[PDB]
């Protein structure tokens, strides 16, 4: 979950997998625009199902654990749909 969460957040911020430090709240990373914040929470909602209460107030590091329990290396709805785009929309010209 600690990798998958990092990637889902990294992808929504148009930012590199190390420019996001895990020891930092979601409302910290997108403090300005509140749209992106909720849009991240909507994505974690689809991806891992059940969330804590005020997930954008607990650091990703801390929140990754809470998911790690009830999730089992499942890509699920959102991540699968992001890879389906990544391949087809980028130019693995023939190889799916």
């Amino acid at each position: 979950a600690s990798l998958l969460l990092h990637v889902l957040v990294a992808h929504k911020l148009k930012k590199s997998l190390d420019s996001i430090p895990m020891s930092k709240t979601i409302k910290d990373l997108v403090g300005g625009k509140s749209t992106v914040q909720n849009e991240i929470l909507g994505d974690l909602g689809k991806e891992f199902g059940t969330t804590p209460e005020k997930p954008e107030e607990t650091p990703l590091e801390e929140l990754a654990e809470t998911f790690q329990d009830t999730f089992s290396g499942a890509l699920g709805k959102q991540s699968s749909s992001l890879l389906s785009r990544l391949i087809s929309s980028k130019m693995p010209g023939g190889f799916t």
Partner: protein, 192 residues
């Protein structure tokens, strides 16, 4: 006296009943259209390629609507008027376009960018083929305000709600070009 034509992209199609009177027009648009839209890829995930039959017909309505003139009666007017009347009777079942855009978004693996263009295409088409919105729509909410169930209040926002408000004006103008074009134009003159 009719004749079948099949708009298709990879695995999905809409079968389209063109009066043979105006077929040599439509089949020339079909091949011109069938080369612009890209190579089918699994899931139909890439932003350009449509994901359902409903989107594919919409992509067409747009491409045809981009060749009509709003005054000059050209060749494509009756072509477009029999893509609309198909699209409205298959996929809208006498609802609004927005009610359809919703369904696709929670059923099928469409995105927002994918469903924004479908609303652009349909509403462009409706106006390029002189069919202006004049029917007092059967909106559940407004049937409910007449009956006296629902009370409505309008509220308007202000500054502070976004970093770039101007992307809201751009996205609004990109999609409802054919409804707001006149109000935008009026403001631009009235401020200038």
């Amino acid at each position: 006296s009719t004749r079948p034509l099949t708009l298709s992209h990879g695995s999905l199609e809409h079968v389209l009943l063109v009066p043979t009177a105006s077929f040599f027009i439509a089949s020339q648009l079909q091949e011109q259209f069938n080369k612009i839209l890209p190579e089918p890829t699994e899931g139909f995930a890439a932003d350009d390629e449509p994901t359902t039959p409903a989107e594919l017909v919409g992509k067409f309505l747009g491409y045809v609507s981009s060749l009509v003139e709003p005054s000059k009666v050209g060749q494509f007017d009756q072509v477009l008027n029999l893509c609309l009347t198909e699209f409205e009777n298959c996929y809208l079942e006498g609802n609004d376009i927005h009610a359809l855009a919703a369904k696709l978004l929670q059923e099928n693996d469409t995105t927002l960018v994918k469903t924004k263009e479908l609303i652009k295409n349909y509403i462009t088409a409706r106006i390029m083929a002189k069919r202006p919105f004049d029917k007092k729509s059967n909106s559940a909410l407004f049937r409910a305000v007449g009956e006296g169930n629902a009370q409505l209040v309008a509220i308007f926002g202000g500054q502070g709600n976004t970093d770039d408000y101007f992307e809201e004006l751009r996205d609004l103008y990109q999609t409802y070009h054919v409804l707001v074009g006149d109000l935008i134009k009026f403001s631009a003159e009235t401020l200038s």
